[PDB]
Write a protein that binds this ligand. Structure first.
Ligand SMILES: Cc1cc2nc3c(=O)[nH]c(=O)nc-3n(C[C@H](O)[C@H](O)[C@H](O)COP(=O)(O)OP(=O)(O)OC[C@H]3O[C@@H](n4cnc5c(N)ncnc54)[C@H](O)[C@@H]3O)c2cc1C
Ligand SMILES: Cc1cc2nc3c(=O)[nH]c(=O)nc-3n(C[C@H](O)[C@H](O)[C@H](O)COP(=O)(O)OP(=O)(O)OC[C@H]3O[C@@H](n4cnc5c(N)ncnc54)[C@H](O)[C@@H]3O)c2cc1C
Ligand SMILES: NC(=O)C1=CN([C@@H]2O[C@@H](COP(=O)(O)OP(=O)(O)OC[C@@H]3O[C@@H](n4cnc5c(N)ncnc54)[C@@H](OP(=O)(O)O)[C@H]3O)[C@@H](O)[C@H]2O)C=CC1
Ligand SMILES: NC(=O)C1=CN([C@@H]2O[C@@H](COP(=O)(O)OP(=O)(O)OC[C@@H]3O[C@@H](n4cnc5c(N)ncnc54)[C@@H](OP(=O)(O)O)[C@H]3O)[C@@H](O)[C@H]2O)C=CC1
Ligand SMILES: [Sb+3]
Ligand SMILES: [Sb+3]
Lengths: 485, 487
């Protein structure tokens, strides 16, 4: 009948998972459309998606790089003597080394397509024509030249999401997480606008790679950063970012930005103040990237903010068209899209359908120090459950008596349903948190109870062993009310 | 009736757990006997036991200190430029800082006894007289002066374990893990004898703190270090210790040691060779410390190598006498003794008895890189189960492409029962392994299956997320035989 079984728009974490699966485990003809093969400023995203190119992968590298500032400082207490005063890192060699790693992954994906039969990569901007026709153009402009016309059985949208700007005058003088990865020099005076994942993680990066006398400011619209996270973790992180040199600034928002005649930018604020930053990054949000795909033409229902509306199996308003990952706007994470993709393949090409379990998904924030959480916060579980129990524990790892970094407190907070003991949320702040929370997320998926935690013999000495020592709740919530007992 | 409800011999991980619980949660009169209050070379162990004084706590500190060698080297790739050539660490300031931390904990235990009513610390060497009399002497010599005579209801032995020597001529020229913590200088030429936890961890320490042109040798009796661990992990660790600068030396054993007239030691080996090391540490083993407690007098049954024989609740041959921790010689770990102690209290003073679950206990080895394991190895599970499935995965974390340390491979190996899918063992090598294996150990205690692992959505990017990506077994064991597929 048709040329291909599946055209996947976007060669991202979702795209590549679905594409590869359909083609290899099920031997289907799969065409995968994306913008370019290698990471690069003009268009940013490439083969591998945001995760590989302008997202998690390079992010994590630069976070690791920044973390050495703390680690070099700390080594002194342990006997490691070296010339420490006036010492700042080389940004250029970091971005160099970063590019090398990303590019090598880009390459690994090029040869994957060459070696896999059924799979083929088609470079350009895919757009819908009808239920069975994806049209690859050279531009986002639907008047640019048509490169290919792909006749297909199934269409999968996996084009992800894109940085949100803010309508203020001078908006286009600012950078986003995209351009951040390709800055020529590390900024002396940095402003990070917003209080989310990116905002926080990148503050940590710039703060690590700032040159002499440099400083990073982080301004947030509301009054406590990282809304959605455990409030006791958010407060403790705000302190530790401060202690590490990041000047957190709540209830503040830029209003106008102009360019000084030396390159730098002048920022007008909410409280009417004015300061000069070398660069200003907008970590405002990520709107689904579907404005271009002409979903109207093929009749694909797009709900709130362009997000493609799907059911539990990713099926859209049309039976043969599907969408996965950030473009659906459920839980915007790489492993989620991968799981959504793998499920999609099992659904239509596997015979045995399956829906991605969106609840109790463990994730992490790669700040310094990092956050590792899974499940429900206090606020939510209290406004959803009869009687809840809140366990808490804070401690300084013994090494930090020597290391000098006495601000580095490790925090665990377990949130349970008091009626049966079931663990509804675990929230951790400190080094190793992302690693620990992973195996935690297995227990939560296994419907584990607080009794399962504190009956397991500990592994001494670790930060993680403290999960099994929390016996008595710090306090309770009795139908919405913060009750002491 | 009696002066005290409980006399606990040894203020260790087991002792202080039981002591505190009986005294605070149950308000009993508890006397706790130990050798000294603060850590110190003449006698080594003190308030807090081996764990606090000459064991885990200072160990972990020095491992953290050593790990900076790798971390400073690695930072270069990321842009961190500094004078690296000819750079070695200061050992003296480490031991200084180490002493400060340990002493601080010694002190917090002193004031604990002063603030807790029911609890009292009694300094000296406790020994049994009968079912109800513990006699504190000033020496291990049962002819030294009697300091106190404690009349009690229950006696709890928690005196732990002690380094084993080896009968070779010149044996007493070598140090152990005890004296290691109090060396004046870091040795240039180090020999670590043995292939166990301590042997490996300490090799990593000295290798971190070695001065210029220094080197650490690790000789082991058999042919693969860390016997008892996942054999694929053991082999990978041996390579990585090598790549890190530690010269592993299997099927080798010293036979005679003499002192050169400059301080150093001359070592005669198994293969008849001879070399010169500044220090030689014997990580041979740990025999339970009960040789002195006169158990014979009180009639307490001591089995293999002095270990006090107990049942599942720690009760000895006499009803009122108990033993916990390393002195029983079950699973010699701090959290085990703590759990044994907490159970003991619930058994006799809590009303509701309880036995410590010794199977599926997660532990770790603090080498560079560290090991984190829980449960059964291939070998054992194959010689115990009908049909088994072995999953494996190795990978280099992307950061190590830049960091330069390309030898640092993270390894996960899951061992299941094929019939049911139940996870019988998880074995990990690499940074963060001790931290990850902890929450793993919860799942295995919850009787988790391989299906539970790979259905959990991952946390990207971590080393731990790879636990949920192992779907297809690398191979199988079909009743003892290493089969590549199933029939
Ligand atoms: C800075 C940053 C850090 C992040 N860190 C993490 C993290 O640590 N952990 C985590 O779990 N998640 C992280 N994320 C989110 C993660 O990157 C996404 O959730 C994930 O990439 C979504 O997968 P996807 O397939 O839906 O989209 P993507 O992986 O981004 O793939 C979309 C692809 O579609 C292509 N495309 C766009 N338009 C078209 C079109 N017209 N035609 C054809 N192709 C098109 C794009 O070029 C892109 O490559 C991070 C995101 C950012 C921005
Ligand atoms: C170098 C090293 C590193 C280790 N690292 C770890 C690790 O990382 N994780 C882990 O889980 N375990 C580790 N261990 C083992 C752990 O420390 C022990 O398993 C734990 O301390 C056992 O508790 P215990 O009460 O039985 O013995 P201890 O905690 O050692 O207590 C015994 C106490 O009894 C006292 N005593 C001795 N004789 C008498 C007497 N005659 N009368 C009265 N008191 C006496 C001693 O002074 C001592 O303080 C390590 C051990 C060593 C040697
Ligand atoms: N480690 C990980 O797993 C990572 C995940 N991600 C994913 O992508 C993320 C999207 O990026 P990001 O924007 O950094 O994260 P978020 O969109 O989740 O959070 C950033 C938010 O932007 C601020 N903000 C929103 N609107 C405005 C405005 N008009 N003016 C000023 N400030 C504003 C704050 O919103 P508010 O006032 O409502 O609190 C702040 O909380 C998340 O959705 C996450 O799913 C991204 C990076 C890392
Ligand atoms: N992080 C942790 O959890 C730690 C736990 N520990 C605990 O204490 C440990 C006891 O100390 P340790 O000695 O370091 O570990 P082990 O007694 O478990 O093992 C060390 C062994 O020494 C070697 N050896 C034994 N006998 C001789 C001999 N006669 N001549 C030469 N070599 C010999 C090897 O024995 P073989 O030939 O049988 O393989 C080697 O396996 C463990 O039992 C463990 O329970 C100790 C340190 C850290
Ligand atoms: Sb990612
Ligand atoms: Sb210990």
């Amino acid at each position: 009948s048709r040329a291909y079984d599946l055209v996947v728009l976007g060669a991202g974490s979702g795209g590549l998972e679905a594409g590869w699966n359909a083609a290899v485990t099920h031997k289907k003809k799969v065409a995968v459309v994306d913008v370019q093969a290698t990471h690069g400023p003009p268009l940013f995203a490439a083969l591998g998606g945001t995760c590989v190119n302008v997202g998690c992968v390079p992010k994590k590298l630069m976070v690791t790089g920044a973390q050495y500032m703390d680690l070099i400082r700390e080594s002194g207490g342990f006997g490691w003597e070296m010339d420490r005063e006036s010492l700042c890192p080389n940004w250029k060699t970091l971005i160099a080394a970063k590019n090398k790693v990303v590019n090598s992954i880009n390459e690994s994906y090029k040869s994957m397509f060459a070696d896999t039969e059924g799979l083929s990569f088609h470079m350009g901007f895919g757009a819908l024509q009808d239920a069975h026709t994806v049209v690859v153009r050279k531009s986002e402009d639907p008047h640019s030249d048509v490169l290919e016309t792909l006749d297909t059985e199934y269409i999968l949208i996996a084009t992800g999401s894109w940085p949100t700007r803010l309508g203020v005058p001078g908006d286009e003088f600012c950078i986003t997480s995209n351009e951040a990865f390709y800055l020529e020099d590390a900024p002396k005076r940095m402003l990070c606008v917003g209080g989310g994942y990116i905002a926080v993680e990148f503050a940590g990066i710039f703060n690590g790679y700032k040159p002499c006398g440099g400083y990073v400011d982080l301004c947030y619209r509301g009054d406590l950063i990282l809304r959605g996270f455990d409030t006791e973790v958010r407060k403790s992180l705000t302190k530790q970012l401060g202690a590490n040199g990041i000047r957190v600034r709540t209830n503040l928002n830029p209003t106008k930005i102009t360019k000084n005649e030396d390159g730098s930018n002048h920022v007008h604020f909410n409280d009417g103040t004015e300061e000069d930053y070398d660069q200003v990054m907008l970590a405002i949000g990520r709107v689904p990237r579907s404005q271009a795909l002409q979903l109207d033409k093929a009749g694909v229902r797009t709900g709130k903010n362009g997000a493609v509306q799907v059911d539990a199996y990713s099926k859209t308003s049309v039976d043969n068209i599907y969408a996965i990952g950030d473009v659906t706007n459920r839980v915007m994470l790489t492993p989620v899209a991968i799981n959504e993709g793998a499920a999609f393949v099992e659904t239509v090409f596997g015979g045995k359908p399956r829906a991605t379990d969106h609840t109790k998904v463990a994730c992490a924030v790669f700040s310094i120090p990092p956050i590792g959480t899974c499940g429900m916060t206090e606020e939510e579980a209290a406004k959803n459950y009869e009687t809840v129990a809140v366990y808490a524990s804070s401690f300084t790892p013994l090494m930090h008596n020597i290391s000098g970094s006495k601000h580095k407190e490790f925090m665990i907070r377990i949130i349970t349903n008091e009626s049966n003991g079931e663990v509804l949320g675990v929230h951790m702040l400190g080094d190793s948190a992302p690693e620990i929370i992973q195996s935690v997320g297995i227990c939560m998926k296994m419907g584990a109870k607080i009794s399962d935690f504190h009956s397991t013999i500990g592994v001494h000495p670790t930060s993680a062993e403290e999960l099994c020592s929390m016996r008595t709740p710090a306090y309770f919530y009795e139908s919405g009310k913060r009750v002491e007992k």
